[PDB]
Amino acid sequence: AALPPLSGSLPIPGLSASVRVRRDAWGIPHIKASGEADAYRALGFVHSQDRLFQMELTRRKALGRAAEWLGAEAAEADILVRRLGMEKVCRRDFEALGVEAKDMLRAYVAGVNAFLASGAPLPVEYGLLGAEPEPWEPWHSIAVMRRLGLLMGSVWFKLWRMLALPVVGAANALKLRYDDGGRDLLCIPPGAEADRLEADLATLRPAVDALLKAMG
Amino acid sequence: SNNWAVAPGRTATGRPILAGDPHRVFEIPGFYAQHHLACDRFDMIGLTVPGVPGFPHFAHNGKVAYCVTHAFMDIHDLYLEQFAGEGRTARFGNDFEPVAWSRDRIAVRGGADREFDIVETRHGPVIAGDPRDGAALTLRSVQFAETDLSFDCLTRMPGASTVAQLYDATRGWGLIDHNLVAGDVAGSIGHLVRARVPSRPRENGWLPVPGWSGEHEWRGWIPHEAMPRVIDPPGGIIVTANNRVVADDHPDYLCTDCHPPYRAERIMKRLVANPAFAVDDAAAIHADTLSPHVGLLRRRLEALGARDDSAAEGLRQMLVAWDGRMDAASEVASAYNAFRRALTRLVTDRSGLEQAISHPFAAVAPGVSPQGQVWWAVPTLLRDDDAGMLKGWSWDQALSEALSVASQNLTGRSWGEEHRPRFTHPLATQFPAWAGLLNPASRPIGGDGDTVLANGLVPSAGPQATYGALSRYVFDVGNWDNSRWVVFHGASGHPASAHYADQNAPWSDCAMVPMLYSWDRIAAEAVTSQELVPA
Ligand SMILES: N[C@@H](CCC(O)O)C(=O)O
Numbered sequence: 021a022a023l024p025p026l027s028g029s030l031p032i033p034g035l036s037a038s039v040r041v042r043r044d045a046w047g048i049p050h051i052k053a054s055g056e057a058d059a060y061r062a063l064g065f066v067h068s069q070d071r072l073f074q075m076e077l078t079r080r081k082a083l084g085r086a087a088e089w090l091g092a093e094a095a096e097a098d099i100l101v102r103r104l105g106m107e108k109v110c111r112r113d114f115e116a117l118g119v120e121a122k123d124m125l126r127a128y129v130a131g132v133n134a135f136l137a138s139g140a141p142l143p144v145e146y147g148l149l150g151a152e153p154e155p156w157e158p159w160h161s162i163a164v165m166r167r168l169g170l171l172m173g174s175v176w177f178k179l180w181r182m183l184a185l186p187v188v189g190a191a192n193a194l195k196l197r198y199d200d201g202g203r204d205l206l207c208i209p210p211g212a213e214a215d216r217l218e219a220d221l222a223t224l225r226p227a228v229d230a231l232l233k234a235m236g
Numbered sequence: 237s238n239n240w241a242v243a244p245g246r247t248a249t250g251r252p253i254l255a256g257d258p259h260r261v262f263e264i265p266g267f268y269a270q271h272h273l274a275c276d277r278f279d280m281i282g283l284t285v286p287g288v289p290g291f292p293h294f295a296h297n298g299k300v301a302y303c304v305t306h307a308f309m310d311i312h313d314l315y316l317e318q319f320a321g322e323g324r325t326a327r328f329g330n331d332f333e334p335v336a337w338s339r340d341r342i343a344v345r346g347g348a349d350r351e352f353d354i355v356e357t358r359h360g361p362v363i364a365g366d367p368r369d370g371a372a373l374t375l376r377s378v379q380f381a382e383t384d385l386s387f388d389c390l391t392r393m394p395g396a397s398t399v400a401q402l403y404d405a406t407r408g409w410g411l412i413d414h415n416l417v418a419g420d421v422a423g424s425i426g427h428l429v430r431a432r433v434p435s436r437p438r439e440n441g442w443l444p445v446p447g448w449s450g451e452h453e454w455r456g457w458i459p460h461e462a463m464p465r466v467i468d469p470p471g472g473i474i475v476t477a478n479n480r481v482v483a484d485d486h487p488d489y490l491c492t493d494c495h496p497p498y499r500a501e502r503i504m505k506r507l508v509a510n511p512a513f514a515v516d517d518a519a520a521i522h523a524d525t526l527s528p529h530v531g532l533l534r535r536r537l538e539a540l541g542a543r544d545d546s547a548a549e550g551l552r553q554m555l556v557a558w559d560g561r562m563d564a565a566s567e568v569a570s571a572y573n574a575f576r577r578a579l580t581r582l583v584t585d586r587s588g589l590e591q592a593i594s595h596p597f598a599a600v601a602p603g604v605s606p607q608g609q610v611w612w613a614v615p616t617l618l619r620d621d622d623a624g625m626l627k628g629w630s631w632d633q634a635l636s637e638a639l640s641v642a643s644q645n646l647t648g649r650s651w652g653e654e655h656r657p658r659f660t661h662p663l664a665t666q667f668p669a670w671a672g673l674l675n676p677a678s679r680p681i682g683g684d685g686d687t688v689l690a691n692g693l694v695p696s697a698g699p700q701a702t703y704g705a706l707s708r709y710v711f712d713v714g715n716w717d718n719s720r721w722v723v724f725h726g727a728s729g730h731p732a733s734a735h736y737a738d739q740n741a742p743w744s745d746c747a748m749v750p751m752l753y754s755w756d757r758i759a760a761e762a763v764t765s766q767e768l769v770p771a
Contacts, residue, residue: 022732026764035770042762046749047727047735050272050281050758059275060289062768066271071286071729074265077662078287084342090662091345096601098342103354103361109380116383120391128289144674144731148667162387164287166379168267169412174441175312175375177493179364180604182314182443183592188625194442195622198496198612201528202619204480205497205504207415207427208464211471214483219442227445230316234371235597 024069024140032061032134034127041066057127064131064156065138072135073145076153079160082106082167089149101170106163114159125158132156186235190228194219237305238522238688239417240503241425243472248514252419252713254301255518257705258283258294259690264661264676265729266706268294270721272752278394281719281753283707286729290390293414294709296719298753299397299421301711304414305476308494309431311378311413313440313454315359315447316371323367326357327448333358335367359447364597373444373597376454378410378432386411399426399467406430407460415476421714426467427474429481433458433490441492458488472511475504477688496612498528498686515718518710523746524688530560532619533572540635547643548636551575562689564652564682573654573684573699574645579638580611580695586634587625607696612685652680655691657701659725676725676737679744689746708748717757720748 026043039053039062049066053059067075080086083106084098114125133155146153177197184193195218206212221228239256247253260267268283271291282295293304318327325332336356341349355362357374360381365372378384385408392405399418403426406416410432418426434454439445445452464482466474478495506521507513537556543549554568555575562569584590589606598604617623623630647654661674681701685692691704705724712718722743728735742749752758 023730025766027766029767029769031771032768033771035768037770039768041766041768042758043727043764044752044758044761045763046270046739047733047763048270048272048752049727050752050755050762051274052755053273053275056275056277059273059277063271063273063284063289065768067269067284067286070727071265071269074729075287087342087344089345091666092347093665095342095344095347095350096599099350099352100363100601102340102342102352103363104375104377104380105354105356105361109384113384113387116385118388118391121387124289124391125387132287143729145663148663148670161288165285165292165386166411168285168288170379171312171377172306172412173308173312174310174491174493175314175377175600176604177609178312178314178441178443179598179600180592180609183595183598183604184589185443186595187588187592192625195617195624196609196613197493199614199616199619200480201497201501201615205501206483207474207476207479207481207500208466210427210466210469210474211504212483214480214485216480217438217484220439223439224442226449227316227439227443230446231444234316234365235595 022141022144026069030138032065032131034130034134035061057123060124060127061131061134064128065135068132068135069140072153073143075132075164078164078167082163089151106166110159110162110166113162122158125161128161129156129158182231185228185231190221190224194221194224238477238499238503238690239303239305239415240507241417241419241474242507242513243425243468244423246472246511246513248512249712249715251421251715252423252425253513253515253518253710254303254417254419254713255521255710256303256305256417257522257708258305259692259703260706261703262657262659262701262724264659264725266723266725268707268723270723270727272758280394281751291393292390294707296711296713296716297394297396298716300399300402300418301713302402302416302418303709303711304416304430305478307413307415307429307431307481308478309413309429309433309490310441310492311431311433313376313436313452314444315374315376315452316444317357317359317362317367317374317447319367319370319372323355326367328358329448329450357447363600366596374447378434379412384410398422399424403428403465415481417474417476419711419713424468425474426465427476428465429463431463433488435488438489438492441489462488464490473504473507475500475507477503496528496686499688499690502526502528502688515710515712515720519746519748521688522705522708525562525682526687527560527562527572527684528686529615530558532615536618536631536635540632543636543639545640545643548639551639551643551646562651562682562684562687564650564680566651566682567648569651569682570649570654570699571642571646573651575638575642576611577695577699578641578645579634580607580614582634582637582641583614583626584610586627586629605694605696608694611695650680651682654699655682655684655693655701656680657691657704661731673731676731677740679740681744705743708743708746709751710748716753717750719751719753721751722748
């Protein structure tokens with residue numbers, strides 16, 4: 021009774037035909053639809069039955085609204101995604117999309133919104149927070165997807181080497197990266213090896229000087 | 237993350253086998269959830285992202301299986317901008333141009349609203365530094381800069397029937413860069429770098445670069461057909477594990493930073509020793525715990541010679557004798573970790589890098605960890621004996637000091653108990669009396685950031701695992717019901733659910749559960765069944 025009903029039948033506005041959802045011995049949902057739009061609608065719905073709090077928390081982080089749930093520790097992350105323009109680039113992306121992708125996204129969130137209207141009890145998190153879930157728009161999935169991979173990869177290393185510049189000097193800062201074991205195993209061609217290129221301080225000099233000045 | 241594919245001529249089955257495991261922070265509920273979705277157009281099973289339709293990264297559709305590791309392409313550039321006009325103009329070439337300024341506001345639970353400025357130049361938004369002072373950093377990222385059509389790939393991928401069709405279907409994917417490794421029932425295996433990467437100089441990969449000179453601007457996109465790919469390579473083996481994808485003399489600049497090759501090497505080594513790879517062999521490579529550093533650690537500590545302090549000399553003998561396995565059962569593995577943490581801490585303090593994050597330019601949330609960065613570079617500097625950052629110390633002095641410090645920090649716990657993640661629900665610190673219910677139950681696990689079993693940690697914080705396989709899978713391509721998978725806690729996000737935390741048990745053992753594809757087995761095993769009906 022802290023849990024949504026996972027048996028019987030439940031209505032979804034907008035379905036053309038029934039969809040069957042079987043959860044196995046581990047609770048994994050196997051969803052069987054006729055049409056593709058029904059499939060996506062059912063996936064929105066089933067996602068929310070198991071993971072509503074995750075979904076909305078992840079969306080709030082994407083839209084710079086997580087501090088409304090998490091307090092001050094999420095404040096600086098919210099400010100950053102606002103500065104990055106999450107809503108603007110996700111709406112932009114959505115408008116450019118072909119009709120099948122738009123329809124998939126629309127069907128998906130009509131399933132999410134259907135769950136919100138289904139009268140399930142709310143997850144324990146909403147109880148704790150005194151919160152009510154907010155409805156979903158198609159472009160929201162793009163924001164959630166973007167949040168998942170947000171700033172992964174190279175930016176951290178560049179920011180880090182820049183921060184090291186005035187501390188250890190250029191020659192040293194430019195050695196601040198993950199080890200290569202002495203020589204990389206490459207992916208392509210499989211099995212091939214090669215020595216990575218080290219930094220060319222001579223070509224980097226003007227960037228380095230500019231940053232020294234800027235930081236000092 | 238890890239993945240591999242083995243060709244039909246090297247498998248026990250005579251069909252492709254794909255296996256691996258994505259590595260992320262253990263945020264709760266796990267980023268990936270297991271789903272099976274069928275309709276008249278497709279019948280697919282794999283990992284979904286709650287809140288996003290489709291199977292962006294891990295799935296098969298009964299013809300092609302696919303899975304990814306993060307490629308470490310370079311997809312984000314930082315620009316040092318020169319501003320004037322009290323922040324209102326930024327230089328481009330020899331002209332200062334109007335910058336976009338606007339105001340925004342967030343609410344904060346239990347505190348006041350924060351108002352702030354959003355400043356944007358032709359490169360992108362200012363993320364660090366104050367433009368009013370004349371210089372700040374802007375970010376131009378493939379994730380934000382131009383219209384992205386990745387979501388069009390999601391409706392095309394389900395229809396692919398071969399490796400090559402899958403790779404066509406992903407055209408235009410740019411949200412994130414993946415080694416997309418695939419296998420099909422026709423017998424092919426592939427690896428594509430699925431990414432949109434701008435064409436621009438190697439130099440941009442090292443540091444924020446001048447926004448005004450034009451030396452550093454993006455010159456269009458590396459074409460789809462120029463992205464690295466290989467299909468049915470002659471050794472019959474593909475491995476990727478965040479390691480450098482192509483040699484740095486490749487004609488497009490693609491990467492400066494990636495993971496060391498330890499994991500790929502160890503995966504590759506075990507696959508090479510087994511030209512009859514079976515589905516059951518995946519689990520043993522997942523669980524691999526051999527540290528790549530035992531040799532270096534042993535040589536150096538050996539050469540260091542007996543210490544005067546008694547606890548420290550004991551730690552030394554133990555490390556010199558260690559078999560280098562990060563096994564859950566191993567107490568000496570905890571002591572190696574304690575030693576490496578103390579070592580990394582000392583090097584970071586000594587060099588002044590600990591305070592590098594004092595600068596206002598460091599203020600990009602969530603921030604960089606000096607210890608968390610230096611930890612990965614220590615092996616290189618130690619191996620090359622490069623004491624350049626140790627302010628007069630030699631490596632032998634750092635090592636000896638680290639033995640002394642680390643010997644006071646030995647809990648004696650087996651590495652499994654020392655490293656056991658404390659899976660922390662996002663609301664556990666705000667509702668500490670609920671922490672017991674909210675935090676899924678966790679078991680002892682080995683590995684560290686260097687081992688194929690990649691349960692890594694936060695070195696500044698302690699030995700506890702903070703990231704690792706969110707899921708493991710093996711695909712038996714063309715005998716699909718033999719595929720297997722697991723997630724680190726379970727399908728449910730409801731702390732009350734019987735499936736909130738039940739997969740943690742097989743996951744902690746490096747075992748997996750059936751990935752069921754036949755509807756007749758699914759019908760036979762359904763625990764609950766629900767109809768979702770028109771209005
Ligand atoms: N988890 C990764 C796959 C690569 C791993 O994380 O490095 C991802 O999903 O991007």
